[PDB]
Protein backbone atom coordinates (compact mmCIF):
# COMPACT_ATOMS: atom_id res chain seq x y z
CA UNK A 1 0.00 0.00 0.00
CA UNK A 2 1.07 3.60 -0.67
CA UNK A 3 1.07 6.08 2.22
CA UNK A 4 2.18 9.67 2.81
CA UNK A 5 5.69 8.43 3.65
CA UNK A 6 6.11 6.50 0.39
CA UNK A 7 8.96 7.61 -1.88
CA UNK A 8 7.84 7.74 -5.51
CA UNK A 9 10.95 6.86 -7.51
CA UNK A 10 11.07 9.38 -10.38
CA UNK A 11 7.52 10.40 -9.49
CA UNK A 12 5.43 12.30 -6.95
CA UNK A 13 2.66 11.47 -4.51
CA UNK A 14 -0.94 12.26 -5.42
CA UNK A 15 -4.04 11.82 -3.28
CA UNK A 16 -7.64 11.08 -4.25
CA UNK A 17 -10.76 10.62 -2.13
CA UNK A 18 -9.89 7.11 -0.96
CA UNK A 19 -6.20 6.32 -1.52
CA UNK A 20 -2.79 7.66 -2.51
CA UNK A 21 -0.64 6.64 -5.46
CA UNK A 22 2.49 7.65 -7.37
CA UNK A 23 2.24 9.68 -10.58
CA UNK A 24 5.22 9.64 -12.93
CA UNK A 25 7.11 12.58 -14.42
CA UNK A 26 6.89 13.52 -18.10
CA UNK A 27 6.75 10.36 -20.24
CA UNK A 28 7.68 7.88 -17.50
CA UNK A 29 5.60 4.79 -16.77
CA UNK A 30 4.97 2.92 -13.53
CA UNK A 31 7.12 -0.18 -13.07
CA UNK A 32 5.49 -0.89 -9.70
CA UNK A 33 3.32 1.04 -7.24
CA UNK A 34 6.12 3.52 -6.47
CA UNK A 35 8.78 3.31 -9.23
CA UNK A 36 8.77 5.25 -12.51
CA UNK A 37 11.11 4.47 -15.40
CA UNK A 38 11.47 5.30 -19.08
CA UNK A 39 9.22 3.35 -21.45
CA UNK A 40 10.26 1.77 -24.73
CA UNK A 41 8.68 3.00 -27.95
CA UNK A 42 8.47 -0.32 -29.84
CA UNK A 43 8.53 -3.82 -28.34
CA UNK A 44 11.67 -5.36 -29.85
CA UNK A 45 13.70 -8.43 -29.01
CA UNK A 46 16.18 -6.13 -27.25
CA UNK A 47 13.37 -4.39 -25.32
CA UNK A 48 11.96 -7.63 -23.87
CA UNK A 49 11.06 -7.27 -20.16
CA UNK A 50 11.60 -3.52 -20.48
CA UNK A 51 8.54 -1.45 -19.52
CA UNK A 52 6.28 -0.27 -22.34
CA UNK A 53 3.47 1.26 -20.29
CA UNK A 54 1.93 1.54 -16.85
CA UNK A 55 2.30 -1.94 -15.30
CA UNK A 56 3.25 -3.57 -18.60
CA UNK A 57 6.43 -4.97 -20.15
CA UNK A 58 7.40 -6.22 -23.60
CA UNK A 59 7.26 -10.02 -23.89
CA UNK A 60 8.04 -12.61 -26.55
CA UNK A 61 5.32 -14.51 -28.41
CA UNK A 62 6.27 -17.98 -29.68
CA UNK A 63 4.26 -17.73 -32.88
CA UNK A 64 5.09 -18.92 -36.37
CA UNK A 65 7.59 -16.05 -36.53
CA UNK A 66 8.82 -14.43 -33.32
CA UNK A 67 6.48 -11.66 -32.17
CA UNK A 68 6.70 -9.11 -29.36
CA UNK A 69 3.81 -7.27 -27.69
CA UNK A 70 3.12 -5.11 -24.64
CA UNK A 71 1.39 -7.28 -22.02
CA UNK A 72 0.09 -6.18 -18.63
CA UNK A 73 1.66 -7.74 -15.56
CA UNK A 74 -0.03 -10.45 -13.51
CA UNK A 75 -3.18 -9.20 -11.80
CA UNK A 76 -3.74 -6.51 -14.46
CA UNK A 77 -5.71 -6.46 -17.70
CA UNK A 78 -5.95 -4.10 -20.67
CA UNK A 79 -8.87 -1.64 -20.67
CA UNK A 80 -8.78 1.40 -22.99
CA UNK A 81 -5.07 0.82 -23.74
CA UNK A 82 -4.35 1.04 -19.99
CA UNK A 83 -3.46 -1.77 -17.60
CA UNK A 84 -5.85 -1.85 -14.63
CA UNK A 85 -6.29 -4.55 -11.96
CA UNK A 86 -8.23 -7.66 -12.98
CA UNK A 87 -10.82 -6.99 -10.27
CA UNK A 88 -11.45 -3.56 -11.87
CA UNK A 89 -12.26 -4.82 -15.38
CA UNK A 90 -15.97 -3.96 -15.14
CA UNK A 91 -16.00 -1.33 -12.37
CA UNK A 92 -16.76 2.15 -13.72
CA UNK A 93 -16.58 5.08 -11.29
CA UNK A 94 -17.14 8.07 -13.59
CA UNK A 95 -15.53 10.91 -11.63
CA UNK A 96 -12.82 8.62 -10.30
CA UNK A 97 -10.86 5.41 -10.73
CA UNK A 98 -11.17 1.83 -9.52
CA UNK A 99 -8.68 0.62 -6.90
CA UNK A 100 -8.28 -2.52 -4.81
CA UNK A 101 -9.84 -2.54 -1.33
CA UNK A 102 -6.69 -2.61 0.80
CA UNK A 103 -8.82 -3.43 3.89
CA UNK A 104 -10.04 -6.76 2.47
CA UNK A 105 -7.99 -9.97 2.11
CA UNK A 106 -10.02 -10.88 -0.99
CA UNK A 107 -9.24 -8.72 -4.02
CA UNK A 108 -12.21 -6.41 -4.56
CA UNK A 109 -12.54 -3.32 -6.73
CA UNK A 110 -13.73 -0.09 -5.11
CA UNK A 111 -14.10 3.47 -6.38
CA UNK A 112 -11.68 6.21 -5.36
CA UNK A 113 -12.95 9.61 -6.43
CA UNK A 114 -11.60 12.94 -7.62
CA UNK A 115 -11.18 15.74 -5.10
CA UNK A 116 -14.62 17.14 -4.37
CA UNK A 117 -16.40 13.83 -5.03
CA UNK A 118 -17.18 10.87 -2.77
CA UNK A 119 -18.72 7.45 -3.47
CA UNK A 120 -22.48 7.83 -3.84
CA UNK A 121 -24.23 4.94 -2.07
CA UNK A 122 -27.30 5.54 -4.25
CA UNK A 123 -25.26 5.08 -7.46
CA UNK A 124 -23.48 1.75 -6.88
CA UNK A 125 -20.78 3.61 -4.90
CA UNK A 126 -19.73 5.49 -8.03
CA UNK A 127 -18.23 8.98 -7.83
CA UNK A 128 -21.43 10.98 -8.25
CA UNK A 129 -21.84 12.74 -4.89
CA UNK A 130 -20.37 16.07 -3.79
CA UNK A 131 -18.01 15.79 -0.84
CA UNK A 132 -14.73 17.34 0.25
CA UNK A 133 -11.66 15.24 1.04
CA UNK A 134 -9.09 16.73 3.41
CA UNK A 135 -5.56 16.75 2.03
CA UNK A 136 -3.00 14.79 4.05
CA UNK A 137 0.04 15.21 1.80
CA UNK A 138 3.23 16.41 3.50
CA UNK A 139 4.44 19.29 1.30
CA UNK A 140 7.57 20.34 3.18
CA UNK A 141 9.54 21.92 0.32
CA UNK A 142 10.28 25.64 0.11
CA UNK A 143 6.91 27.29 -0.61
CA UNK A 144 5.14 24.02 -1.45
CA UNK A 145 1.60 23.41 -0.18
CA UNK A 146 -1.14 20.97 -1.11
CA UNK A 147 -3.00 22.10 -4.23
CA UNK A 148 -5.89 20.50 -6.13
CA UNK A 149 -4.80 20.10 -9.77
CA UNK A 150 -6.72 18.05 -12.37
CA UNK A 151 -9.02 16.28 -9.94
CA UNK A 152 -6.20 15.13 -7.62
CA UNK A 153 -4.11 16.50 -4.76
CA UNK A 154 -0.41 17.19 -5.25
CA UNK A 155 2.41 19.20 -3.71
CA UNK A 156 2.62 22.26 -5.97
CA UNK A 157 3.96 25.80 -5.79
CA UNK A 158 2.23 28.28 -3.51
CA UNK A 159 -0.06 30.71 -5.33
CA UNK A 160 2.19 33.30 -6.94
CA UNK A 161 5.31 31.22 -7.65
CA UNK A 162 6.55 29.17 -10.61
CA UNK A 163 9.35 26.71 -11.30
CA UNK A 164 14.29 25.24 -10.92
CA UNK A 165 11.97 25.26 -7.90
CA UNK A 166 8.97 27.28 -6.75
CA UNK A 167 9.66 31.02 -6.69
Amino acid at each position, epitope marked *: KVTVDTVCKRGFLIQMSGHLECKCENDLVLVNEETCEEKVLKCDEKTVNKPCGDFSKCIKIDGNPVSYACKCNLGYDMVNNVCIPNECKQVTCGNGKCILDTSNPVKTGVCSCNI*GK*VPNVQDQNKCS*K*D*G*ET*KCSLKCLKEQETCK*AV*D*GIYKCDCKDGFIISICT
Partner: antibody
Amino acid sequence: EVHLVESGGGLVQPGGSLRLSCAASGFTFSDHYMDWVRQAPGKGLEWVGRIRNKANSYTTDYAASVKGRFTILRDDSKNSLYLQMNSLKTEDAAVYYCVRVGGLGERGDYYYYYMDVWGKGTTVTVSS
Amino acid sequence: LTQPPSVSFSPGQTARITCSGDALSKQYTYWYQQKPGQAPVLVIYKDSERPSGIPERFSGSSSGTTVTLTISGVQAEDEADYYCQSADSSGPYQVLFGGGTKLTVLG
Protein backbone atom coordinates in the same frame (compact mmCIF):
# COMPACT_ATOMS: atom_id res chain seq x y z
CA GLU B 1 -17.12 43.23 -9.48
CA VAL B 2 -19.81 40.73 -8.44
CA HIS B 3 -23.41 41.57 -7.53
CA LEU B 4 -26.23 39.38 -6.20
CA VAL B 5 -29.49 41.34 -5.99
CA GLU B 6 -32.38 39.60 -4.24
CA SER B 7 -36.03 40.41 -4.93
CA GLY B 8 -39.51 39.17 -4.10
CA GLY B 9 -39.57 39.50 -0.32
CA GLY B 10 -42.64 40.68 1.52
CA LEU B 11 -45.45 39.80 3.91
CA VAL B 12 -47.48 36.63 3.34
CA GLN B 13 -49.96 34.81 5.55
CA PRO B 14 -49.12 31.37 6.97
CA GLY B 15 -49.79 28.58 4.50
CA GLY B 16 -49.37 30.88 1.50
CA SER B 17 -46.77 30.77 -1.24
CA LEU B 18 -44.04 33.18 -2.29
CA ARG B 19 -41.30 33.24 -4.94
CA LEU B 20 -37.91 34.90 -4.55
CA SER B 21 -35.48 35.95 -7.28
CA CYS B 22 -31.79 36.81 -7.53
CA ALA B 23 -30.19 38.74 -10.40
CA ALA B 24 -26.51 37.83 -10.74
CA SER B 25 -23.89 39.90 -12.55
CA GLY B 26 -20.12 40.10 -12.85
CA PHE B 27 -19.29 36.42 -13.37
CA THR B 28 -20.16 33.35 -15.44
CA PHE B 29 -23.43 32.40 -13.73
CA SER B 30 -23.82 29.02 -15.45
CA ASP B 31 -20.47 27.82 -14.05
CA HIS B 32 -21.27 28.18 -10.34
CA TYR B 33 -23.50 26.49 -7.83
CA MET B 34 -26.08 28.76 -6.21
CA ASP B 35 -27.34 28.48 -2.63
CA TRP B 36 -30.01 30.05 -0.45
CA VAL B 37 -29.16 30.95 3.16
CA ARG B 38 -31.70 32.49 5.53
CA GLN B 39 -31.37 34.13 8.94
CA ALA B 40 -34.20 34.74 11.40
CA PRO B 41 -34.35 38.16 13.12
CA GLY B 42 -31.69 37.96 15.82
CA LYS B 43 -30.72 34.31 15.23
CA GLY B 44 -28.00 32.38 13.45
CA LEU B 45 -27.46 31.40 9.83
CA GLU B 46 -29.53 28.52 8.45
CA TRP B 47 -28.93 26.80 5.12
CA VAL B 48 -31.93 26.38 2.82
CA GLY B 49 -30.78 24.57 -0.30
CA ARG B 50 -28.45 24.36 -3.28
CA ILE B 51 -28.82 24.09 -7.05
CA ARG B 52 -25.95 22.88 -9.23
CA ASN B 53 -24.61 23.78 -12.66
CA LYS B 54 -25.10 22.03 -16.00
CA ALA B 55 -21.94 20.01 -15.37
CA ASN B 56 -23.75 18.38 -12.42
CA SER B 57 -27.17 17.92 -14.08
CA TYR B 58 -28.77 20.89 -12.26
CA THR B 59 -29.39 18.65 -9.24
CA THR B 60 -30.73 20.04 -5.97
CA ASP B 61 -30.42 19.45 -2.23
CA TYR B 62 -32.24 21.08 0.68
CA ALA B 63 -32.28 21.17 4.46
CA ALA B 64 -34.72 19.02 6.41
CA SER B 65 -36.58 22.05 7.79
CA VAL B 66 -37.65 23.22 4.30
CA LYS B 67 -37.71 19.88 2.46
CA GLY B 68 -40.71 19.36 0.20
CA ARG B 69 -41.97 22.91 0.69
CA PHE B 70 -39.15 24.96 -0.87
CA THR B 71 -37.88 24.54 -4.42
CA ILE B 72 -34.83 26.20 -5.98
CA LEU B 73 -34.84 27.10 -9.67
CA ARG B 74 -32.40 28.86 -11.98
CA ASP B 75 -32.38 30.44 -15.44
CA ASP B 76 -28.82 30.47 -16.78
CA SER B 77 -29.97 32.36 -19.89
CA LYS B 78 -31.19 35.19 -17.63
CA ASN B 79 -28.54 34.92 -14.86
CA SER B 80 -31.32 34.45 -12.32
CA LEU B 81 -31.82 32.28 -9.23
CA TYR B 82 -35.26 31.54 -7.80
CA LEU B 83 -36.73 30.11 -4.59
CA GLN B 84 -40.31 28.82 -4.75
CA MET B 85 -41.59 28.83 -1.16
CA ASN B 86 -44.80 26.90 -0.44
CA SER B 87 -46.80 26.20 2.73
CA LEU B 88 -44.98 28.95 4.59
CA LYS B 89 -44.80 28.70 8.38
CA THR B 90 -44.07 31.47 10.85
CA GLU B 91 -40.68 29.79 11.36
CA ASP B 92 -39.87 30.60 7.72
CA ALA B 93 -39.96 34.37 8.31
CA ALA B 94 -36.33 35.47 7.89
CA VAL B 95 -33.93 37.38 5.65
CA TYR B 96 -32.99 35.18 2.68
CA TYR B 97 -29.52 35.57 1.18
CA CYS B 98 -28.53 34.76 -2.41
CA VAL B 99 -25.16 33.01 -2.25
CA ARG B 100 -22.60 31.97 -4.88
CA VAL B 101 -20.57 28.80 -4.27
CA GLY B 102 -16.86 29.04 -5.01
CA GLY B 103 -13.98 26.62 -5.26
CA LEU B 104 -14.59 25.02 -8.66
CA GLY B 105 -11.95 23.71 -11.03
CA GLU B 106 -11.53 23.64 -14.80
CA ARG B 107 -13.96 20.70 -15.16
CA GLY B 108 -17.21 22.31 -14.03
CA ASP B 109 -16.94 20.22 -10.85
CA TYR B 110 -15.67 21.62 -7.55
CA TYR B 111 -12.67 20.76 -5.41
CA TYR B 112 -14.10 22.63 -2.41
CA TYR B 113 -17.57 23.92 -1.50
CA TYR B 114 -17.61 27.32 0.20
CA MET B 115 -19.69 30.50 -0.02
CA ASP B 116 -17.49 33.28 -1.39
CA VAL B 117 -20.07 35.90 -2.48
CA TRP B 118 -23.19 36.88 -0.52
CA GLY B 119 -26.03 39.21 -1.42
CA LYS B 120 -27.68 42.06 0.46
CA GLY B 121 -30.70 39.83 1.08
CA THR B 122 -34.46 40.23 0.95
CA THR B 123 -36.80 40.16 3.94
CA VAL B 124 -39.73 37.72 4.13
CA THR B 125 -42.39 38.14 6.82
CA VAL B 126 -44.94 35.44 7.70
CA SER B 127 -47.78 36.45 10.03
CA SER B 128 -51.57 36.59 9.92
CA LEU C 1 -21.72 22.10 14.74
CA THR C 2 -21.07 23.68 18.14
CA GLN C 3 -19.36 26.98 18.97
CA PRO C 4 -19.54 29.25 22.04
CA PRO C 5 -22.29 31.88 21.87
CA SER C 6 -20.08 34.78 22.98
CA VAL C 7 -16.42 35.68 23.47
CA SER C 8 -14.76 38.86 24.73
CA PHE C 9 -11.18 40.11 24.39
CA SER C 10 -9.31 43.33 25.07
CA PRO C 11 -7.83 45.33 22.17
CA GLY C 12 -4.55 43.81 21.03
CA GLN C 13 -5.22 40.35 22.46
CA THR C 14 -5.33 37.17 20.37
CA ALA C 15 -8.95 36.09 20.01
CA ARG C 16 -9.85 32.43 19.56
CA ILE C 17 -13.22 30.95 18.59
CA THR C 18 -13.64 27.16 18.58
CA CYS C 19 -15.95 25.14 16.34
CA SER C 20 -16.59 21.47 17.15
CA GLY C 21 -18.31 18.71 15.20
CA ASP C 22 -17.87 15.14 13.97
CA ALA C 23 -18.17 16.28 10.35
CA LEU C 24 -15.11 18.51 10.92
CA SER C 25 -12.80 15.48 10.58
CA LYS C 26 -14.09 14.58 7.09
CA GLN C 27 -14.58 17.92 5.30
CA TYR C 28 -13.15 21.41 5.74
CA THR C 29 -14.36 24.23 7.98
CA TYR C 30 -15.17 27.74 6.76
CA TRP C 31 -15.58 30.90 8.84
CA TYR C 32 -17.83 33.86 8.01
CA GLN C 33 -17.82 37.35 9.53
CA GLN C 34 -21.17 39.14 9.77
CA LYS C 35 -21.35 42.74 10.95
CA PRO C 36 -24.68 44.25 12.10
CA GLY C 37 -26.97 44.87 9.14
CA GLN C 38 -24.46 43.58 6.57
CA ALA C 39 -23.99 40.43 4.54
CA PRO C 40 -21.64 37.69 5.79
CA VAL C 41 -18.06 37.60 4.50
CA LEU C 42 -15.76 34.60 4.16
CA VAL C 43 -12.61 35.24 6.20
CA ILE C 44 -11.10 31.75 6.56
CA TYR C 45 -11.48 28.76 4.24
CA LYS C 46 -10.06 25.23 4.25
CA ASP C 47 -9.58 25.25 8.04
CA SER C 48 -6.50 27.48 8.10
CA GLU C 49 -6.04 29.37 4.82
CA ARG C 50 -7.33 32.88 4.23
CA PRO C 51 -8.88 34.29 1.03
CA SER C 52 -7.52 37.25 -0.89
CA GLY C 53 -8.31 40.54 0.82
CA ILE C 54 -8.25 39.29 4.43
CA PRO C 55 -5.61 40.77 6.77
CA GLU C 56 -2.84 38.50 8.00
CA ARG C 57 -4.15 38.60 11.58
CA PHE C 58 -6.87 36.11 10.58
CA SER C 59 -5.81 32.46 10.78
CA GLY C 60 -7.09 29.06 11.83
CA SER C 61 -6.00 25.65 13.05
CA SER C 62 -7.46 22.14 12.89
CA SER C 63 -7.00 19.41 15.52
CA GLY C 64 -9.32 16.47 14.95
CA THR C 65 -13.00 17.35 15.35
CA THR C 66 -12.30 20.92 16.53
CA VAL C 67 -11.32 23.95 14.45
CA THR C 68 -10.17 27.20 16.08
CA LEU C 69 -10.44 30.62 14.44
CA THR C 70 -7.57 32.91 15.46
CA ILE C 71 -7.46 36.71 15.25
CA SER C 72 -4.14 38.11 16.49
CA GLY C 73 -4.28 41.65 17.83
CA VAL C 74 -8.03 42.21 17.65
CA GLN C 75 -9.16 45.56 16.29
CA ALA C 76 -12.51 47.13 17.08
CA GLU C 77 -13.09 46.68 13.34
CA ASP C 78 -13.23 42.93 14.04
CA GLU C 79 -16.19 43.09 16.45
CA ALA C 80 -18.89 41.06 14.68
CA ASP C 81 -20.67 37.70 14.66
CA TYR C 82 -18.72 34.68 13.42
CA TYR C 83 -20.29 31.51 12.01
CA CYS C 84 -18.41 28.31 11.18
CA GLN C 85 -19.68 26.09 8.38
CA SER C 86 -18.90 22.64 7.01
CA ALA C 87 -20.70 19.87 5.14
CA ASP C 88 -21.96 16.31 5.53
CA SER C 89 -22.03 13.91 2.57
CA SER C 90 -23.08 10.90 4.66
CA GLY C 91 -26.53 10.92 3.11
CA PRO C 92 -27.90 13.75 0.98
CA TYR C 93 -25.64 16.78 0.82
CA GLN C 94 -26.07 18.99 3.89
CA VAL C 95 -24.43 22.32 4.67
CA LEU C 96 -23.71 22.53 8.40
CA PHE C 97 -23.69 25.81 10.32
CA GLY C 98 -22.68 26.59 13.89
CA GLY C 99 -24.65 28.56 16.43
CA GLY C 100 -22.51 31.65 15.94
CA THR C 101 -20.20 33.60 18.24
CA LYS C 102 -20.54 37.26 19.20
CA LEU C 103 -16.98 38.60 19.40
CA THR C 104 -16.88 41.74 21.56
CA VAL C 105 -13.76 43.90 21.54
CA LEU C 106 -13.86 45.35 25.05
CA GLY C 107 -14.12 49.13 25.29
